[PDB]
Paper text:
An intriguing aspect of lymphocyte development is that the generation of a population of self-tolerant immune cells requires Ras activation by two distinct guanine nucleotide exchange factors, Ras guanine nucleotide releasing protein 1 (RasGRP1) and Son-of-Sevenless (SOS). To identify the structural basis for the regulation of RasGRP1, we have determined two crystal structures of RasGRP1.
Residues 747–789 within the C-terminal region are predicted by the COILS webserver to contain a coiled coil and are spanned by the RasGRP1CC construct. We determined the crystal structure of RasGRP1CC at 1.6 Å resolution. Leucine and isoleucine residues stabilize the dimer, and a pair of glutamine residues in the core maintains the proper sequence register between the two helices. Two pairs of ionic interactions (Glu 754-Lys 759′ and Glu 782-Lys 783′, where the primes refer to the second subunit in the dimer) further stabilize the dimer. The structure of the C-terminal coiled coil demonstrates that a second dimerization interface is present in RasGRP1. Consistent with this structure, RasGRP1CC is exclusively dimeric in solution from 30 μM to 1.5 mM monomer, based on multiangle light scattering measurements (data not shown). The fact that the C-terminal coiled coil is parallel and dimeric is consistent with an ability to readily connect with the autoinhibited catalytic module and reinforce formation of the C1-mediated dimer. Because coiled coil formation is independent of the C1-mediated interface, RasGRP1 is likely to remain dimeric upon disruption of the C1-mediated dimer by membrane binding. Dimerization in this way is expected to enhance the affinity of RasGRP1 for the membrane by allowing the dimer to engage two Ras molecules simultaneously.
Author numbering:
A (entry chain A): 745 to 793
B (entry chain B): 745 to 786
Amino acid sequence: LPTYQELEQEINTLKADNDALKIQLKYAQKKIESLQLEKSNHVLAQMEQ
Amino acid sequence: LPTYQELEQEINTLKADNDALKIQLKYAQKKIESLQLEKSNH
C-alpha cells in the first residue's frame, strides 16, 4: 500500500494540477470572448463599464 | 489530522475535479479552434 506520506505528496501534485487547469480554463474562456469580440472590432479590456 | 482513508477520499475527489476541468478545457480549446477557422474564412 502507498505510505501516508506518499498520499500526502500525491495530494500536493493533484492540487497543483487543479490550480493549473483552473487558470488555463480561465485563460481559454477569455480567449474565446476575445475572438468573439474581434468580430466587431472590439477587445476585452474596452468592455468594462 | 486527516486519517489515511480521508486522504484516499481526497485523492478521489481531486482526481474527479481534475478530470472535469480537463473536459471543460478541451471543449474550450475546440471552441477556440472553431472560432479561428471561422475567422480565417470570414
